Amino acid sequence: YPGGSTPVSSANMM
Amino acid sequence: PTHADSLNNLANIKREQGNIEEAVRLYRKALEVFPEFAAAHSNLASVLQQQGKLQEALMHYKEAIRISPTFADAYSNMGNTLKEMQDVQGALQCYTRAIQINPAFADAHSNLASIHKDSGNIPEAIASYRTALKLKPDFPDAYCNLAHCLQIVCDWTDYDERMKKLVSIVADQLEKNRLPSVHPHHSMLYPLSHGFRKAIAERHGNLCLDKINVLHKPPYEHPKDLKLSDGRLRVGYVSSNFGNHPTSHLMQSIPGMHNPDKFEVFCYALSPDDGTNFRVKVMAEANHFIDLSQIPCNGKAADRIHQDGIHILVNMNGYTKGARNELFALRPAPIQAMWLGYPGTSGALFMDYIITDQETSPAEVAEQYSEKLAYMPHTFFIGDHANMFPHLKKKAVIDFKHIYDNRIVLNGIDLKAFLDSLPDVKIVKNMPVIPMNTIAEAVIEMINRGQIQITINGFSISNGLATTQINNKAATGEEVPRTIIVTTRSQYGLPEDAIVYCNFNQLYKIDPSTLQMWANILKRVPNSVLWLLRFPAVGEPNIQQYAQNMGLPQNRIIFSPVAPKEEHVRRGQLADVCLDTPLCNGHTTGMDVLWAGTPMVTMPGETLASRVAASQLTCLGCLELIAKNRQEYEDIAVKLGTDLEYLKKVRGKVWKQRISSPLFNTKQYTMELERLYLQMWEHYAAGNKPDHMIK
Ligand SMILES: O=c1ccn([C@@H]2O[C@H](COP(=O)(O)OP(=O)(O)O)[C@@H](O)[C@H]2O)c(=O)[nH]1
Ligand SMILES: *[C@@H]1O[C@H](CO)[C@@H](O)[C@H](O)[C@H]1NC(C)=O
């Protein structure tokens, strides 16, 4: 969120 | 010089044969004969980088760029190494120098684009990907990465042709036996066949096998019974998300709810301690907590898992950020299962099971998974909402005039006591209603003035827009709020006299067909708005443009910023109906909206990720909200928005069933999860290979 962080499910690097 | 040329040739030969250490030895021998050998330094650095020796690879990259100042390829690959070492600024310098040395270097522009992408700067990533493709039109990695950028911001220019080209690229790469340029986690968003999606994942699982085969470790000896564990089954949960992340927001209570007489819980953390209460709780309630982030070697970390005697190792990452699937490729445990964190198949032979359910993964689409299906009785999905947000179990409303349940809302642990201090409180049949009086005017005044909080009869009344100023740990879900919170449609600019359809997902889950469906619903329900999030904000102008092309004025769609976790869940009470994304459903997001009591309309597809919402609703007990096709989805949504008595019934049903159904019952979930574990074990202990557990 603006001013903080909202972690989500995201892909790993390749 | 000539001898060093021959030595570098032999090292390249031994490299292709897979003898990496002989290649290293011969690269070093070439450098011994001719020290100022740029190609040898660059070859050796590439080999060291593949082994994971990033610091040592950096040494030889630095030599290569000094000897050959025009060695643009070395700067680019050096930046790749710095990116993996998490030195983003250093990697940007190397990519920038590579493009300065050779402006036609397509790979360097694409690598620079990925830095912008990872940094959040999608318009800059898109610009750099298009430059790469202008320089090299046949460039799968850049084309597929550009496609995902355009997905994130809902840029659907030439969408059908784009989707056709993505399929063609994957078909060619699978045919030519190369690693697909589409990431397995993204494959759910594209109209690939189930076979292609499984094959993409299978190719990634083979990467992990290739990385662990160089360790030349033998197969582990696995326990054959439960004697050495005193009759207890040893379950190891492996996750990079023990901390502030959706994973812990779903399952942080499950380790402490396991039965210690029959289970011994090991939590293997792939990330360092982020200091949050989510990490505190899992560390305190698991029987054992092991920080594998301190053990970078996958061989030594796998030895640790095997030493603990784990019977069932649980993969909670799949192909998501922070994963170390090399641990599972080494097979330290006799049973290894996918659970909760990754909505797709691993495609890998070292994963035995995927924990799902009949609604999410019916036996008919089992060919989509490489694992054997392992059914939970209701849904495999779970959430910690009853523990994290108990203040939303009940609510009260303020009648600012019939009676609305979602215009002005109060929630709080001490709400009942506050209500008991007020006269003329009415109970609607049960929802308490505060009449329009001096108390009610003071609340509205606080909201309009942007005030943080007030006091009424000694009770703390907080503005729901200001939780990070009152208690930041309450705003993130790390603590239960200790004040009474006000949530109102005026806080977000929502109409007081219209139906509010919401969707709080990241915008990447929307596609053209979905927005057209939503536009059809808004046209049929003239007194309604669609409520979406700036997720990211740069997707907002694209959605609005497509909505305007579909015939919807700007005032039919309302955007809100992404909110802290508790405010996100709490403000879902203001909507009438959630319209779920069929391409990839709300997963964590669907649990969030249902905990607020909001009915959710879904159209399940064929992939796991497109069926999670219907499974949640089936467990909740609302079969009437599950659509078989796009027309039924529209019809259901329009009926909820126009049959106001039906809407009240369904909202009452969701409101009650989120408590009385199994959906949010973490104790029941753990016990069913334990029943499924013992089925896996007793099947293995009897000497059988994994088979479907679907009863
Ligand atoms: O305004 C918002 C919208 C969402 N979320 C959270 O952000 C995450 C969304 O991540 P993801 O897209 O991976 O959710 P999922 O696919 O599981 O539905 C979830 O934890 C939500 O609860 C939030 O905190 N504030
Ligand atoms: C996000 O993370 C949660 C919890 O790990 C998971 O259940 C969900 O499927 C993830 N979402 C996506 C789109 O991968």
Side-chain angles (χ1 to χ4, degrees):
Chain A
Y1 61 94
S5 68
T6 294
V8 300
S9 290
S10 46
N12 60 331
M13 302 270 81
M14 76 180 186
Chain B
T2 305
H3 181 16
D5 276 337
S6 301
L7 285 165
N8 177 74
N9 175 36
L10 298 172
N12 288 339
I13 296 169
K14 243 62 182 59
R15 177 182 189 170
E16 305 303 324
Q17 306 169 9
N19 205 335
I20 296 300
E21 298 295 348
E22 266 291 295
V24 171
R25 190 188 63 87
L26 292 165
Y27 284 134
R28 297 191 191 278
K29 187 65 179 182
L31 295 176
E32 184 182 327
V33 178
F34 188 35
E36 298 290 298
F37 197 175
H41 279 292
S42 179
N43 287 335
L44 178 54
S46 179
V47 164
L48 295 167
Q49 177 190 356
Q50 297 178 196
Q51 290 181 314
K53 304 179 180 183
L54 304 180
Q55 284 177 125
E56 201 175 4
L58 211 53
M59 275 187 69
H60 296 278
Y61 281 132
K62 292 175 181 175
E63 285 303 308
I65 64 181
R66 177 189 57 75
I67 298 169
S68 184
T70 64
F71 206 173
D73 189 69
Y75 273 98
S76 175
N77 287 322
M78 184 177 164
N80 284 348
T81 299
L82 292 178
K83 186 187 176 189
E84 186 171 348
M85 301 175 63
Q86 298 169 336
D87 177 5
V88 175
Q89 291 191 16
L92 215 165
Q93 305 317 303
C94 288
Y95 296 144
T96 296
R97 289 292 298 118
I99 292 170
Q100 288 179 337
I101 298 174
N102 176 5
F105 191 8
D107 294 336
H109 289 280
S110 189
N111 295 334
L112 178 58
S114 304
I115 293 299
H116 295 299
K117 186 180 195 296
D118 297 331
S119 302
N121 198 345
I122 306 296
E124 212 64 73
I126 286 169
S128 289
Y129 280 132
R130 283 173 174 156
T131 300
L133 293 160
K134 180 182 178 179
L135 289 167
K136 187 161 64 187
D138 183 22
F139 196 171
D141 285 350
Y143 184 92
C144 295
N145 285 332
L146 169 62
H148 190 242
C149 286
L150 302 172
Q151 187 85 21
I152 288 170
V153 304
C154 298
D155 188 319
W156 305 326
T157 312
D158 300 326
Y159 178 82
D160 294 339
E161 184 192 293
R162 187 196 306 161
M163 294 303 106
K164 284 188 177 178
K165 185 161 175 183
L166 293 176
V167 177
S168 184
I169 287 166
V170 172
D172 185 51
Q173 292 173 322
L174 290 178
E175 197 185 35
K176 293 174 173 171
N177 190 73
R178 296 210 59 182
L179 185 72
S181 288
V182 167
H183 192 283
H185 190 237
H186 304 163
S187 63
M188 64 183 186
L189 309 166
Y190 307 136
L192 300 157
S193 64
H194 298 299
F196 278 10
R197 293 200 197 92
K198 186 164 80 173
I200 289 172
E202 187 190 19
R203 296 299 178 86
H204 281 248
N206 284 339
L207 294 176
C208 304
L209 283 170
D210 291 337
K211 293 178 183 176
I212 66 133
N213 286 336
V214 316
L215 302 168
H216 298 107
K217 301 175 67 67
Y220 289 98
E221 287 182 354
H222 295 140
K224 199 182 181 178
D225 51 49
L226 312 182
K227 290 189 176 60
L228 300 188
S229 53
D230 193 30
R232 307 167 66 188
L233 190 72
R234 286 171 164 157
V235 183
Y237 293 105
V238 182
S239 178
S240 68
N241 304 127
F242 289 137
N244 181 27
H245 184 275
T247 290
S248 298
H249 306 163
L250 299 186
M251 52 64 66
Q252 62 168 344
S253 292
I254 290 186
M257 288 178 169
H258 273 285
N259 177 14
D261 186 43
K262 300 287 179 186
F263 296 86
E264 191 179 14
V265 180
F266 296 74
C267 283
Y268 295 96
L270 302 186
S271 58
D273 189 346
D274 68 355
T276 64
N277 289 346
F278 308 111
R279 178 68 160 240
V280 170
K281 186 192 187 56
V282 173
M283 293 182 67
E285 298 188 0
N287 302 115
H288 307 279
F289 195 96
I290 301 89
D291 183 5
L292 294 184
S293 67
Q294 309 299 329
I295 305 177
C297 181
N298 292 319
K300 302 175 182 183
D303 290 343
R304 177 74 95 91
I305 296 173
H306 176 260
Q307 164 197 112
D308 292 335
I310 303 299
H311 301 99
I312 300 177
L313 200 63
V314 180
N315 190 331
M316 297 168 68
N317 268 95
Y319 302 119
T320 54
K321 181 184 171 62
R324 290 174 62 178
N325 299 318
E326 291 76 9
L327 303 174
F328 293 84
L330 283 155
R331 290 182 186 174
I335 303 173
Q336 302 187 155
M338 306 282 304
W339 174 60
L340 192 54
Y342 184 74
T345 181
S346 71
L349 287 187
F350 52 79
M351 300 307 309
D352 300 286
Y353 293 104
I354 176 168
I355 297 174
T356 179
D357 60 86
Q358 184 185 359
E359 305 295 326
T360 304
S361 315
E364 308 91 66
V365 301
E367 296 179 349
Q368 165 199 168
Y369 310 92
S370 66
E371 310 86 341
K372 297 297 183 183
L373 303 174
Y375 281 179
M376 293 290 283
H378 296 99
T379 182
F380 81 100
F381 226 79
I382 192 61
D384 202 51
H385 297 66
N387 177 52
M388 286 178 63
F389 315 118
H391 63 298
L392 306 180
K393 285 182 172 59
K394 301 188 192 174
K395 65 173 187 292
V397 303
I398 294 178
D399 188 23
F400 64 104
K401 190 183 179 179
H402 297 286
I403 290 175
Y404 296 139
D405 71 349
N406 56 13
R407 264 59 168 185
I408 306 169
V409 181
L410 302 182
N411 307 93
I413 293 303
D414 303 305
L415 180 56
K416 182 178 173 187
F418 170 63
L419 291 173
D420 288 339
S421 76
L422 304 176
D424 304 313
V425 172
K426 297 179 179 183
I427 304 295
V428 184
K429 299 91 180 181
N430 279 225
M431 184 186 58
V433 179
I434 299 172
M436 192 67 178
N437 50 28
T438 302
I439 307 305
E441 294 168 348
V443 173
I444 296 179
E445 178 180 346
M446 172 185 66
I447 308 296
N448 293 339
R449 295 171 54 89
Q451 292 173 164
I452 302 312
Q453 62 205 342
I454 62 184
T455 298
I456 301 175
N457 296 342
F459 292 89
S460 323
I461 308 303
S462 298
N463 189 329
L465 288 178
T467 61
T468 66
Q469 303 172 66
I470 299 164
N471 180 357
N472 194 61
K473 282 195 180 281
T476 58
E478 287 177 73
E479 290 182 3
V480 175
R482 293 185 301 275
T483 73
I484 292 157
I485 303 178
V486 185
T487 314
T488 76
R489 285 190 168 186
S490 66
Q491 281 169 337
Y492 303 100
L494 299 171
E496 308 285 334
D497 58 341
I499 297 288
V500 171
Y501 300 101
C502 72
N503 186 292
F504 298 148
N505 286 305
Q506 303 188 63
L507 301 178
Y508 81 82
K509 298 185 178 175
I510 310 162
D511 55 13
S513 58
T514 299
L515 182 61
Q516 177 70 69
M517 274 214 305
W518 292 350
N520 290 347
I521 293 156
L522 295 176
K523 292 186 190 299
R524 288 183 58 187
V525 185
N527 205 25
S528 73
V529 304
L530 177 67
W531 188 15
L532 306 170
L533 306 185
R534 304 190 190 101
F535 214 168
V538 289
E540 175 176 356
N542 286 328
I543 293 298
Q544 282 286 5
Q545 184 63 71
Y546 290 128
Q548 179 182 100
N549 300 344
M550 289 169 182
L552 301 173
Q554 185 188 356
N555 67 347
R556 308 293 312 268
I557 302 189
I558 291 164
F559 279 87
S560 299
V562 174
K565 183 87 176 187
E566 186 278 339
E567 174 189 345
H568 157 59
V569 182
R570 177 166 42 69
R571 72 186 174 182
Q573 299 174 103
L574 303 176
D576 294 283
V577 177
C578 178
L579 300 180
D580 179 51
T581 39
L583 180 64
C584 169
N585 303 160
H587 297 173
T588 309
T589 302
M591 300 297 281
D592 299 334
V593 86
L594 292 174
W595 186 248
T598 310
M600 174 170 53
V601 183
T602 189
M603 184 181 70
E606 305 185 28
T607 71
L608 194 162
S610 69
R611 299 182 60 85
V612 167
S615 172
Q616 300 171 346
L617 293 169
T618 301
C619 174
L620 189 69
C622 295
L623 297 181
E624 68 280 13
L625 291 169
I626 303 174
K628 292 183 187 58
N629 55 42
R630 294 191 305 267
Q631 182 60 68
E632 188 173 36
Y633 182 112
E634 299 173 4
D635 284 339
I636 291 170
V638 170
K639 181 179 174 187
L640 290 163
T642 59
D643 189 339
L644 296 193
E645 289 297 298
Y646 184 66
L647 179 59
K648 177 187 305 301
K649 171 185 176 184
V650 175
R651 290 182 56 80
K653 198 177 178 188
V654 175
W655 182 256
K656 170 191 182 305
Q657 288 294 123
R658 81 213 154 103
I659 305 299
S660 59
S661 79
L663 184 52
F664 293 93
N665 192 322
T666 50
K667 184 61 179 187
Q668 177 172 1
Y669 187 91
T670 306
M671 295 179 55
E672 299 292 354
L673 189 55
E674 289 174 325
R675 186 184 306 266
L676 180 59
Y677 286 159
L678 294 172
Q679 293 175 221
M680 294 175 180
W681 175 253
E682 292 161 19
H683 188 76
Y684 168 84
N688 308 282
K689 290 185 179 179
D691 202 353
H692 302 289
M693 308 287 175
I694 57 174
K695 284 192 303 187

